[PDB]
């Protein structure tokens, strides 16, 4: 599986602050967590709500040492045209993170989210830790938007267990909730408490 | 990819009501939505919290015409032993849904959740509709527990767009929130309504 | 070669009069000549000048029983967004012919104009006769715009020799110019005249 | 595709000034632009009009640092026989550029213009820059003559954008017309200037 | 065949004294004989009688410089749960030897005891000498328990012929019985009696 | 694996009552249990003690509806020459069961007991039930003789659990000892002899 | 080998009487012997002497129920241009037999006369009987012209042995010379003389 | 094709002066032209007339720095038996050149004259120049004898154009007839013996 | 092995009574035993002595329902020339049996006696019964001639056991000698009389 | 073919003087001629007569620098049991040469005498010279015993021509008989004396 292993590296053109840049995924290793989400096409319907939802809460991810990266098979010129469209008109407005262009579809293919039939990507999202290892996947069919909240929760759980490597996070864990020690003897400390 | 296609069928033994039964995944086609979640091993730590979290809210899924199915590579005798252990002792107590045994590991293989190094499954969860099609995938590494709330949300979004085939669900959609029509002309109806 | 043989058939989504339609190339067989031109990407620079140039002279092609079809690897949503952009802003405005979407890149691949490196098509143009046979190719690198005039000339020559199957068109032939009979004995009638 | 890449090199005999010479395509790299055009056969009909049309305007290409090269599958003895036939008799008369013999058909094969059924080349024309890279392709079926004017236009556009690497040539561009900068911000300078 | 050759080596997790340890089979080479037995699954019926049967007599095997190793496809968490159950409740109680986990099933596969249809091992038992060579195999279908007595007999025969490499053991040989020299001329001393 | 599946069928010549006969293994299906044991070579040392040991107790197996079959890679002419040798001279004397000749070695090969290096069989023994399914394997290296007593115990346990299909035999079970009637709880929808075997 | 077997059939365009025709080699089966000769290229030097040499003596071959076919890799347009040139200007003038175009080079390839390096045929000549069988091959390198006399001699020998199938032709046989019967006992009549 | 390229080399036993010798074809390179002719079998009918015809005119070839070599699939013992047979009896008598034995048939095979159906060679003749390059081929079916006169003509034409490397021989050329000095117009940059050959 | 199986069939031209015939090996099945011997080459040295030895004793084989067949890779014309050569001159003289020509060497190849290095056959001899099955092979290197006496003995033993299918022939068996019954209990008749 | 080439080497256990030895065929190279004969099985019927026939005349072969080697697929224990059986009882009695055991059947396989159907060897016999090259093979089907006399004759002829490398042995050659020189002109000495 992809989860539990190093992410497939890529180097691609992207749009950031309405300028054309390059983004190399491995360049974030050692530096930040990465939330990499794919969406099907520019100028669609669920996709702008996801993209701007993540843009509006980007400060929360930046303060948690996490970068957000959006990817679709569109070119950087579609990306740029869409950034310059008003949100009220179905556009994106200005974005707080890079919009990555996968024109060759190799990135979507390497993450297993490419629908070969249609040449577009599913709504797949991947949380990558500072060592470059994929720790989480959410993959939705095209009609169902994802959740910034659940992405935030999963990310906080990952950072929590990586700072306290002797803990694991129970179902529904939030910051402030009790964790547990994955040990037949010490986990009882949790199981008695409830 | 798995999402967007018919689920790989299986027929496997399971523990239900402390009895041994058989479960065939395709038997739910035409009848119920399926939430199929894998966990690594019996007598572990995050896994019991996931299993009982879903069991305690099983009635809510039952009201939504959805069955929950837990799967791991352990045998049905380990499953039965774990159900008969108290929750206070790290056990499951009584379960409201079948615990399926993937003893040959073929089910985990077909859903791409098997860590071949270790012979156990990742924390993969799959939502399957009444036609047997996978519509949602959640896959966590072994240490991070999942969320029954987000599973409930995604399942409800799927049911909404399947009853209203002209709608799609925006980011963060919950029941009661506005959806939109995936049409460049009718989408403006949703878009020109956000201050 | 592609030229001299039946065009590779396709069925694809397209934008026409700002609506989503389907276009099947073989459906024009027996009905009209087809001028099929590929361009690299939506929201570029030479491409809008080519697309609108052909749009403005579309009546000349319609009166000659010829349809124009543009193709790129962009989706119909980019196509539609670009049609709804003003020409003064680098957009296309309203188009007189369909804009075809090759999201899977199979069409560009089958016509041999796909740059595999970049996932976009070269500036290839193909004139297809009423039997579906490719009779002409113009393929330019990305920086050089094509010519509506030379396309018109080549098309008029093709229709001329197909109406008078005993004639062929010399270099630079225009309507009104003398043709010749490709026959060792009758071609002399041309060669003496000049 | 051929366009956008280095041309397939060849070394072949040719007729020039009614003498037998050798021509190596890569020998023009670093020195001149190359217009390489194929024609099907000697002693035919459209082909002599193309060949002499280019010969009569050869001086214009020579002024543009460009050589013209004609190629067909005929031998150099047929080529020489055709040059020595009067134009009034369907011949070539004197030619200003080499006529290359593709007797083994390997050159036509490498440029994708060989009709394998018939063993002759289509009316393919290729523009090659000083680095040896194909920048333009014209391929006609056997009955439709080509245009020296459009070849001149495309060659001049190529030379313009290669001397001005920040420019691109719009549709129908001729020398003296405005070009544009392929940049979403600087392109508006061209676009907001057309009534 | 497996018997007569070096055992397929493995490194696996196991439960011993209610702790998780590692066991590498080649680590016993030069040190002890190994009695390596597979059983199908934890929390079953015949298997606990075999496992505890070997545990109760482990001192007899240890005095013979022999270690016992139990293996099944269950994880160490099932193994530990089963050890921490009393024998009266269907458990194993405390064991005198390691319970090995073959969670990937590769060990059962390499010893040819994996029923691929069912993903569990047959009741296969292997006697391995100090050089790491398989000398004996007992493989039962799931319903028939094995016998610690016959394992002890076979191990004693193997140890006898390895300490007296010029002897071989006749049918039913027990310590104290006559052996014979596998030689046409010297066997006659045995058959004449 | 071989155990748990139908035995590989064979048809071979054999020595019985000092005459050359044919034996087809599938012919015992429906009729008798089979104790099929291999030994490496004729005129050896452990092998005659095993062979005569089984012949001397053959009546006990006959009363249990069981036939014994010995197999080796020697020909029937070796088998007959060895049967006609006195036991005091290392021979077999007359035997109560057939001695099967595996000259082409395909039989040893199909049962996985052929040492390819040496062209002889290990001391493999196989207990086969009335449906032809191998239920037990004992495979010894060449120097260690087998036990007729343990073969009898395993055979008796197999016959017990097949006659009482709800029972299983614990470790070390002998006739007269308690068996086990396990009670895996299957639902009645599933209920219509697998799980009590583990 | 080609000699002794049916010729590779072909259908090709040719020039005859300054007109474009088609020639299919199997169309001559049952009707005429075929003298099929290849030459390298049109507008050369040895080749016209061979082509016109055969043309000037075509009546001698036609009286023997034999057609001559010339083949080169040039097109019919080169062929026609060369025919319409006078012999005094290096041309062929009018020809008594078809000039075949092997523009795809497949015919030369199938008769093994194609020099692949140069894309032209050697000076190969083949005599084909009324059943379509190759009976004789003459293959020269480019600088040595062939001989119409030896072609006539070989054709006359082949026709002789096919009309008298019990005879064979000795070395240098011409019409009027003694033949022999290929038989150990009847050959003696020949060798005794 | 064979013609225009170096001959396939061979080394074979042969009969010469009623003794067994060896012949290696590459040994003539730099030294003599070679007329290498195959015939199907010894003790036949067209073949002796060809063989004796070449032997009787061998001096004419010797004076032209040319060796003749006959080859067939028969052994040297057949060749010697046939040489020792009188010509009036269908034999060869003594020969002026070696008779080469192709018992393994590799020689006939390398020259493409082996009828695989029958294991014998067609009446193939090959003229090889001093550099070892085949310049001419005549291949007759088994019933048609070849012509020593035409071999002489072709050989003389080859020697002429190789001694006068600017000339070529028209159709039917004989010594004394006009040759041709063609004048293909190559540029002096290209000018430093191909094109006048066509 | 060849011995014990049907001989590889062939059809080949041969010389018999100084005439050309065809010989098909399977045509002797049911009719005669066959002694098929190969020799290396015509006009050699050991081979003529073998061939004439078999011809001189051919009547003894004919009375035993046996044909002799000699085979070498030479043609029928070499064979005929050699038959018409006097024995004092190294020839064969008149032959009582056919001389078969294996020009394509397929026969020598199928009986495994062809020296591929040299294209000739070894001194292999095969005794074939009326059913077409090879019962004996003798294969000598080129310098060691074979023995007609031993061929007659082997043939006579084969005919004996095929006439008395319950008997087998001990070492050195000749007509008049004791046979034995290949049975443990019946062979005692032969064994007990050993002196 | 095997005849004319180095024999396939082997190393095998054998019985000699009622002891177990090892025998390596290449160890006889340079030292002795080898008569290597296969027989089908121990305790059979033709085979003991062959084995004892060779043992009884072994001294004649020993004086000719020749060893005898018998081979069958039986084990050395069958071999020893058979040697220790009386000849009147179908046994061998004491043997003058080694009995080799081919239990894995590789030796019979490499000499082409193994009947794969039955796993036993044919009655194949091979004469091997001091250089290790097979010069003669006799292969009989199971019922026809071989001849020690013909083996001695073939061996004596081989030794004769290897001692006189300019001679070859005609058909039926025995010591004292005329040889011949395999040369067209020298063979006339033999041929001209034919009566």
Swiss-Prot record, chains A, C:
Homodimer; disulfide-linked, upon oxidation. Interacts with the plastidial thioredoxin CDSP32. Interacts with the plastidial NADPH-dependent thioredoxin reductase ANTR-C. Its EC number is 1.11.1.24. The active site is a conserved redox-active cysteine residue, the peroxidatic cysteine (C(P)), which makes the nucleophilic attack on the peroxide substrate. The peroxide oxidizes the C(P)-SH to cysteine sulfenic acid (C(P)-SOH), which then reacts with another cysteine residue, the resolving cysteine (C(R)), to form a disulfide bridge. The disulfide is subsequently reduced by an appropriate electron donor to complete the catalytic cycle. In this typical 2-Cys peroxiredoxin, C(R) is provided by the other dimeric subunit to form an intersubunit disulfide. One of its GO terms (biological process) is cell redox homeostasis. The chain holds residues 73 to 266 of 266 of the full protein. Belongs to the peroxiredoxin family. AhpC/Prx1 subfamily. The active site is at residue 47. Induction: Down-regulated under highly reduced cellular thiol pool conditions. Down-regulated by ascorbate. Slightly induced by oxidative stress. Transmembrane segments: none annotated. It is an enzyme of class 1 (oxidoreductase). GO terms for molecular function: peroxidase activity; peroxiredoxin activity; salicylic acid binding; thioredoxin-dependent peroxiredoxin activity. This is 2-Cys peroxiredoxin BAS1, chloroplastic. Residues 1-160 form the Thioredoxin domain. GO terms for cellular component: apoplast; chloroplast; chloroplast envelope; chloroplast stroma; cytosol; stromule; thylakoid. Keywords: Antioxidant, Chloroplast, Disulfide bond, Oxidoreductase, Peroxidase, Plastid, Redox-active center, Transit peptide. Thiol-specific peroxidase that catalyzes the reduction of hydrogen peroxide and organic hydroperoxides to water and alcohols, respectively. Plays a role in cell protection against oxidative stress by detoxifying peroxides. May be an antioxidant enzyme particularly in the developing shoot and photosynthesizing leaf. The keyword Plastid applies. The gene is BAS1. It catalyses: a hydroperoxide + [thioredoxin]-dithiol = an alcohol + [thioredoxin]-disulfide + H2O. It is found in: Plastid, Chloroplast.
């Amino acid at each position: 599986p992809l989860v539990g292993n190093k992410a497939p590296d890529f180097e691609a053109e992207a749009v950031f602050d309405q300028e054309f840049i390059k983004v190399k995924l491995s360049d974030y290793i050692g530096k930040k967590y990465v939330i990499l989400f794919f969406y099907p096409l520019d100028f669609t319907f669920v996709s702008p709500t996801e993209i701007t939802a993540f843009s509006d809460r980007h400060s929360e991810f930046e303060k948690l040492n996490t970068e957000v990266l959006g990817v679709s098979v569109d070119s950087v010129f579609s990306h740029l045209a869409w950034v310059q469209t008003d949100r009220k008109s179905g556009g994106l407005g200005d974005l707080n993170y890079p919009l990555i262009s996968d024109v060759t579809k190799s990135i979507s293919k390497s993450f297993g989210v490419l629908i070969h039939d249609q040449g577009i990507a599913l709504r797949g999202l991947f949380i990558i830790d500072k060592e470059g290892v994929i720790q989480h996947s959410t993959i939705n069919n095209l009609g169902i938007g994802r959740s910034v909240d659940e992405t935030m929760r999963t990310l906080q759980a990952l950072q929590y267990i990586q700072e306290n490597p002797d803990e694991v996070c129970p179902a529904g864990w939030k910051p402030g909730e009790k964790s547990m020690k994955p040990d037949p003897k010490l986990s009882k400390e949790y199981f008695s408490a409830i």
